[PDB]
Amino acid sequence: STAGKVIKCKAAVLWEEKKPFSIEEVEVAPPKAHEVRIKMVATGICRSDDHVVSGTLVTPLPVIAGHEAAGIVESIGEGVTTVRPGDKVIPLFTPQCGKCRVCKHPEGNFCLKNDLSMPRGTMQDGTSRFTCRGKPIHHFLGTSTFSQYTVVDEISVAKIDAASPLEKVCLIGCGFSTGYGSAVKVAKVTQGSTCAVFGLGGVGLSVIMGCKAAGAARIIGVDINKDKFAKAKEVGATECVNPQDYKKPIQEVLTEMSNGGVDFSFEVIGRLDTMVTALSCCQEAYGVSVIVGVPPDSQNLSMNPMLLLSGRTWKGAIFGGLKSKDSVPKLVADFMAKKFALDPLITHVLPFEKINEGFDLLRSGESIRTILTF
Amino acid sequence: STAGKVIKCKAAVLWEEKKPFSIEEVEVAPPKAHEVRIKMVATGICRSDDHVVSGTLVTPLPVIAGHEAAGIVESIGEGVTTVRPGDKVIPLFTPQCGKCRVCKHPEGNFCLKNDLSMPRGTMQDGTSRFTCRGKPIHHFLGTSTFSQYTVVDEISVAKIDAASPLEKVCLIGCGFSTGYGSAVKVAKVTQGSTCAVFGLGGVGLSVIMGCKAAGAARIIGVDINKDKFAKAKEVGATECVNPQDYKKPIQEVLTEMSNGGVDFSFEVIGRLDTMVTALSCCQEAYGVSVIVGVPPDSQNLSMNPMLLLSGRTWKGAIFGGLKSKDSVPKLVADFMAKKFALDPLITHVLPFEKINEGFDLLRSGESIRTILTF
Numbered sequence A, B: 001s002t003a004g005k006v007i008k009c010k011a012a013v014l015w016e017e018k019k020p021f022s023i024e025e026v027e028v029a030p031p032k033a034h035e036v037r038i039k040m041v042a043t044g045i046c047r048s049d050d051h052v053v054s055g056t057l058v059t060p061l062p063v064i065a066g067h068e069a070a071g072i073v074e075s076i077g078e079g080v081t082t083v084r085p086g087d088k089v090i091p092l093f094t095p096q097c098g099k100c101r102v103c104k105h106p107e108g109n110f111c112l113k114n115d116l117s118m119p120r121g122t123m124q125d126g127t128s129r130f131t132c133r134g135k136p137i138h139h140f141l142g143t144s145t146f147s148q149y150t151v152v153d154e155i156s157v158a159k160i161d162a163a164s165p166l167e168k169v170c171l172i173g174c175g176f177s178t179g180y181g182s183a184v185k186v187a188k189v190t191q192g193s194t195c196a197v198f199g200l201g202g203v204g205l206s207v208i209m210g211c212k213a214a215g216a217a218r219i220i221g222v223d224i225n226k227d228k229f230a231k232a233k234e235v236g237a238t239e240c241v242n243p244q245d246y247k248k249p250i251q252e253v254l255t256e257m258s259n260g261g262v263d264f265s266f267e268v269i270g271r272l273d274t275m276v277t278a279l280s281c282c283q284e285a286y287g288v289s290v291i292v293g294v295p296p297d298s299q300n301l302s303m304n305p306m307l308l309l310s311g312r313t314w315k316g317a318i319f320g321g322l323k324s325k326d327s328v329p330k331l332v333a334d335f336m337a338k339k340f341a342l343d344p345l346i347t348h349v350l351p352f353e354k355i356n357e358g359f360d361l362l363r364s365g366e367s368i369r370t371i372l373t374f
């Protein structure tokens, strides 16, 4: 009955930086050609969504944020072939168009159709599907999951198993896949190796899971919030360190602990200083450091390139380096087969209408992932 | 016989920064246990030796520099097993102790016994074998090849083919192996790829050689000195560009030429700016950039980590990533089997006594490699 019609629904609109979300009525246009309209079921609160609020991440406002989610297709536009009404789906904040030089490359994932590098806050066609108070509202990363209904381009959605528990698998849309992939695919963590993980939130925990799955012998968690250590150990950390406890810089501490530097390090926070610290702590001749955290907009880091000349490898990735549309359904299948766990990441559950409380929990340090249910 | 005796011989002593080498008599002590005294036959002038003169590289002075060379063993200390008097050898500025965690690592080559990171300018035992005018003179990288005789630790010397032409294979001691290995081993250049090489001196030409040997389809040379272009093309560059010819930054030019970024880039100059430019010009999702050049002491670069977050890989290496004592004899064997050419690197051959004139040729832009013959 709603196919081809505008849907009025509730969404969490961010009108201004540094302000609460406003849960209010929006109008969601029907899908155009090669677009998919989704009834949201669950969405996680990721720190990158908070970055939009804080201005760490710059994207056009006003906006409907949210990028870690799962739902059910309500309708499809003309020409859509990869999903149908009633399918369970995960929106893909990194698209997979399948046609660009990155999508065709054996390793790359950062499809050239992404709306991350130079955000416009639109659909692929440069327009918006959202109206609120009579005003157009921007999209976020082509996903905009903080709404009872969203519209996404086909290249930004993956069909997943029909029996999937959406209130769990939404985490495959960002935090789990990013961390796990960053360890297994990007870093290529080896059996017997020593890893250091900076930041023990949902993504860092997922990095630890990946390092443990890859066979690391030592996984050293690093966080300034010691309350994060117990869960990090539960998912595989062998030791945890708080930089605030030490007189020496933590790169020196980690070098000492690893008898000359770690094999793999990960920055999973979003600070320039910890990006350089994490590079430094990996072994100077053969270490690898991966940047996962999102730094503040337009700010440069300073480093000595001798850190690299000796032999270190430095890299970053979006979404764990995973080709999104290929990988998401496989990860859901593997979850269903108990190949990895998601429950350790979920510390709180709230209805969507309590989104602001969910952000308060993240900001206070108390939560890992809060899952919002529509 | 000279064995067991102090040798008085000619060497090029650097008494202070930014002055000519002084060609004069030095005393060379006999080798102690696990040391090798070598009669030099040929040594190349590498830009890294000029960095000692210019203060770009800090190492204790006064010093006998030189690190790219070949000669013949005059005598061995107690306990030496890997070379014998009369053997042709190449000194190894990056040692291979075989025992440290780096030597045991499948990939690493920057042996922990090196004298690069924190130079002492001595033998492994913390003493010097050189005196001049009654004063102790420092070693350089455990090699000190700007002397008719030097003494090196066993871990810093490789035996090579007895039939080798030492006036050519001395380049395997630094410039050829560095560039070639940086392409083939460190970057792992792939067949059909597009490469950009910043700096078309001896090392950059060797990077071209390696990119061509790895099957690159396009190899774009970049230099401010257009006189370098003809030789770059002879050894495999498909195109050359001079940044001075353009009104836009060269990373933009290279991104446009490569239809969105190169597969592999190499910084083979030693400037902070060109290191960031080289990284930027590689494709944002899957590009790899390798730092080869040596930058000025204690200077940090500035860069936006979004260049890495999108998926680039940034790395550096010493000596092409090659395990030195394993690799050098194999490279010489490969040269003797006509697997690569060295002649294109050699533009001048001078007696040792003309060392200063050789450095002047380098500084004026007129030479690639000058080989000094003893």
Ligand SMILES: NC(=O)c1ccc[n+]([C@@H]2O[C@H](COP(=O)([O-])OP(=O)([O-])OC[C@H]3O[C@@H](n4cnc5c(N)[nH+]cnc54)[C@H](O)[C@@H]3O)[C@@H](O)[C@H]2O)c1
Binding pocket: A046, A047, A048, A051, A174, A175, A178, A198, A199, A200, A201, A202, A203, A204, A222, A223, A224, A225, A228, A243, A268, A269, A270, A271, A274, A291, A292, A293, A294, A295, A317, A318, A319, A320, A368, B309
């Ligand atoms: N690359 C990607 O695709 C991608 C995907 C998802 C998240 N992100 C980013 O990854 C980062 C982590 O996200 P998250 O796990 O949801 O965030 P989070 O739950 O806020 O976790 C960050 C952790 O860092 C800790 N921390 C803060 N400062 C320091 C410090 N100075 N030293 C050590 N620990 C510190 C903090 O206590 C917290 O536990 C954020 O910057 C995200 O924006 C990137």
Ligand SMILES: NC(=O)c1ccc[n+]([C@@H]2O[C@H](COP(=O)([O-])OP(=O)([O-])OC[C@H]3O[C@@H](n4cnc5c(N)[nH+]cnc54)[C@H](O)[C@@H]3O)[C@@H](O)[C@H]2O)c1
Binding pocket: B046, B047, B048, B051, B174, B175, B178, B198, B199, B200, B201, B202, B203, B204, B222, B223, B224, B225, B228, B243, B268, B269, B270, B271, B274, B291, B292, B293, B294, B295, B317, B318, B319, B320, B367, B368
């Ligand atoms: N990593 C290693 O193990 C290693 C080994 C050997 C050499 N090096 C370094 O590698 C670098 C090159 O050595 P080399 O080939 O003997 O030196 P070289 O022969 O002086 O060549 C350098 C080239 O860079 C060119 N150049 C200078 N400025 C620019 C610019 N702004 N943009 C483009 N081109 C420019 C210059 O014209 C010259 O052709 C030096 O910094 C060495 O110290 C490192």
Ligand SMILES: OCc1c(F)c(F)c(F)c(F)c1F
Binding pocket: A046, A047, A048, A049, A057, A067, A093, A116, A141, A174, A294, A318, A319, B309
């Ligand atoms: O959490 C994933 C995520 C990122 F990794 C970004 F780089 C980004 F800009 C963003 F908006 C985002 F949501």
Ligand SMILES: OCc1c(F)c(F)c(F)c(F)c1F
Binding pocket: A309, B046, B047, B048, B049, B057, B067, B093, B116, B141, B174, B294, B318, B319
């Ligand atoms: O040319 C090789 C070379 C280097 F790569 C250095 F990093 C260095 F410090 C040095 F002295 C040197 F000779």
Ligand SMILES: [Zn+2]
Binding pocket: A095, A096, A097, A098, A099, A100, A101, A102, A103, A111, A112, A113
């Ligand atoms: Zn694509």
Ligand SMILES: [Zn+2]
Binding pocket: A046, A047, A048, A049, A067, A068, A174, A175
């Ligand atoms: Zn996220």
Ligand SMILES: [Zn+2]
Binding pocket: B095, B096, B097, B098, B099, B100, B101, B102, B103, B111, B112, B113
């Ligand atoms: Zn070693």
Ligand SMILES: [Zn+2]
Binding pocket: B046, B047, B048, B049, B067, B068, B174, B175
């Ligand atoms: Zn050199």
